[PDB]
Amino acid sequence: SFSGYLKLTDNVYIKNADIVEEAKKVKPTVVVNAANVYLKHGGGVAGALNKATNNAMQVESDDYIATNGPLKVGGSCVLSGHNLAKHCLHVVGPNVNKGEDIQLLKSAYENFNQHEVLLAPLLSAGIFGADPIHSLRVCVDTVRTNVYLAVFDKNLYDKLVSSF
Ligand SMILES: Cn1ncc2c(C(=O)N[C@@H](CC(=O)O)c3ccc(Br)cc3)ccnc21
């Protein structure tokens, strides 16, 4: 049910799209969230996904942290996808604006390999401060399962395709 994507490799696809609108249309098995270790979904992709769930994602996430403590940078957890997907895979890429090790970006993408197909954003891009061209290259070189990347910004999408 994914449509309109540009094929980059055997398993990686990309589209200029709002991941919330894409998730509402497709209702994928897995949507990836660009999470932080606390699962505090304030801004960026996480703020947008949480708002689309009417804050249900944040209420579930606060219970998960109260029980388990914070995630690791490069780690993940599977929670409900609420009205957006069957599941949400919350993945923590390194935040350059907080000074985190960019080498953890490959470990972050390795979480995607536990799922046959995913709808996802580029990790560590946007307000996380990493170069999105670098993030797409690590994604291509690490993920082996089928990943459908939604890039919100039209100008960034064009730059990512042209420089691939
Ligand atoms: C309504 N809302 N607010 C943010 C956001 C995001 C979001 O932060 N995406 C990131 C990642 C991406 O989409 O490639 C991003 C956005 C813009 C630039 Br420029 C660079 C990275 C995605 C969906 N809905 C969103």
Curated annotation (Swiss-Prot):
Compartments, record wording: Host endoplasmic reticulum membrane
Effect the entry attributes to changing T29A: In strain: Mu/B.1.621
Membrane topology: Multi-pass membrane protein
Effect in UniProt of substituting S162L: In strain: Gamma/P.1
Regulation affecting activity: Inhibited in vitro by GRL-0617.
Catalytic activity: Thiol-dependent hydrolysis of ester, thioester, amide, peptide and isopeptide bonds formed by the C-terminal Gly of ubiquitin (a 76-residue protein attached to proteins as an intracellular targeting signal)
All copies of domain Macro, residue ranges: 1-164
Assembly notes: May form homohexamers. Interacts with N protein.
Annotated function: Responsible for the cleavages located at the N-terminus of the replicase polyprotein. Participates together with nsp4 in the assembly of virally-induced cytoplasmic double-membrane vesicles necessary for viral replication. Antagonizes innate immune induction of type I interferon by blocking the phosphorylation, dimerization and subsequent nuclear translocation of host IRF3. Also prevents host NF-kappa-B signaling. In addition, PL-PRO possesses a deubiquitinating/deISGylating activity and processes both 'Lys-48'- and 'Lys-63'-linked polyubiquitin chains from cellular substrates.
Protein name: Papain-like protease nsp3
Boundaries of the shown chain within the full protein: 1027 to 1190 of 7096
